[PDB]
Design a protein around this ligand. Structure first.
Ligand SMILES: [Zn+2]
Ligand SMILES: [Zn+2]
Lengths: 155, 154
């Protein structure tokens, strides 16, 4: 575990992110999932997965889909949340975290994918905890085993 | 730092999008993406926060969603036109897609660290200081400040 320490809702958050990745996988998309949790009370504001294949979407990464599914929120709500993602965030999803002032991002794995985003979050004073979750590494591997041209065309 | 012949069209369309969004009751921020080689508009969009209850459809994001999935080779010779200087999320989109050039209507009503970050990451940013863009955006912010604050996460 790099980038910080686990906190009390991190098992719940990563479990939901993984469930969303597994749902996306079963739909025929890239298994990338997320959810946004209130750090105070553990409430789930929203959950989502990557909709690139499901909707032919350029922008609906797992983190963007998760934020879309939370709906419109007052800016102050995002300030004590953690965004859970099964996969290290790209520059756009990094940008979402910074723009909304989401203080903390918990990342399943950064072996299959890492951008300059991960470092940039730390440059901008955000917390990025990489938990190296084997369940996230395994489902991404099953997608890449089946659909390497879909994966390497995306990244 | 040479102009593209398509920049007047790009900013005209971006502004059309912003004015349409305003008339629909949304945030007046618009964009389009143009192929630098032949002047093809690949997509166009405006902020859809109020229209769709969307926390992600900033004008720049809407524009890029509207383009559909393009090949990396195509994004690498495009300009993204936006009426307003991009937030950190829309800056991240430009970097992620490899869009080399961003033409900005104005950075007076709004500017993030993204404008300089784009240049740090090797992208060209052009700020036109367009008075049409500054007026419609100031009018929205003056009349609906809480709605503006929601749109920038504040
Ligand atoms: Zn992303
Ligand atoms: Zn934006």
């Amino acid at each position: 575990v790099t980038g910080g320490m686990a906190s009390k809702w991190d098992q719940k958050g990563m479990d939901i992110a993984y469930e969303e990745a597994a749902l996306g996988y079963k739909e025929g998309g890239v298994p990338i999932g997320g959810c946004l949790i209130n750090n105070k009370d553990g409430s789930v504001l929203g959950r989502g997965h990557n909709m690139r294949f499901q909707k032919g979407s350029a922008t609906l990464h797992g983190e963007i889909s998760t934020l879309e599914n939370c709906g419109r929120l007052e800016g102050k709500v995002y300030k004590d949340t953690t965004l859970y993602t099964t996969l290290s965030p790209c520059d756009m999803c990094t940008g979402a975290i910074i723009m909304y002032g989401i203080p903390r991002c918990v990342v399943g794995e950064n072996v299959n994918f890492k951008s300059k985003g991960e470092k940039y979050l730390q440059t901008r004073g955000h917390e990025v905890v990489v938990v190296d979750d084997e369940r996230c590494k395994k489902i991404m591997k099953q997608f890449i085993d089946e659909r390497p041209q879909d994966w390497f065309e995306d990244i």
